[PDB]
Subunit: 46 residues, 5 copies
């Protein structure tokens, strides 16, 4: 019945949030790759 319009707003907010997890992950991937790079060039390690 009248519950359908909100089901939409919930599926609307489940995408707004996921969109944010989508970019914060792609950021963390870059930061990690970078973290990896600094270690590859670590004289202390050899």
């Amino acid at each position: 019945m009248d519950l359908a319009p909100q089901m939409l707003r919930e599926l609307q907010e489940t995408n707004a949030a996921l969109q944010d997890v989508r970019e914060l992950l792609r950021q963390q991937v870059k930061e990690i790759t970078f973290l990896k790079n600094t270690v590859m060039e670590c004289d202390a390690c050899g």
Copy 2:
């Protein structure tokens, strides 16, 4: 007549959980960004 309310509830339950997942990531990012800086300043490497 239908299971619409039980459905509406699960949806909003997916959101509240996504709320926590979104926050844990934001925090985890400040941590990996901090970590990354320490090894760039680490005397032992370069």
Copy 3:
């Protein structure tokens, strides 16, 4: 009527999954915050 009970089962499983993912992240953040503190006190970096 046919798939409605099935659209509820899946939703409930979406949260069960997201429930473990939610508690899985909590542990990852802490391990990562421990690794940071550890690296910080590292007597070779500073």
Copy 4:
């Protein structure tokens, strides 16, 4: 009304994908904790 069969598909796919993300997080923490244990007994930091 018709649209339930197609909506069910998208949900089963949602749980198949999430099904993978769950295990990925279980392995990511697995090695994060090994990375921890590694820097702790690391004779450079002590």
Copy 5:
């Protein structure tokens, strides 16, 4: 009924984003696995 279709757009969208999150993670894990193997191969630790 009236909005049934609009709910299908959102679901399909969460699927797409899930694939993105998914493939981002299999990469982040691929990287963290390297960082682990590398710190283990660090001569500074011994």
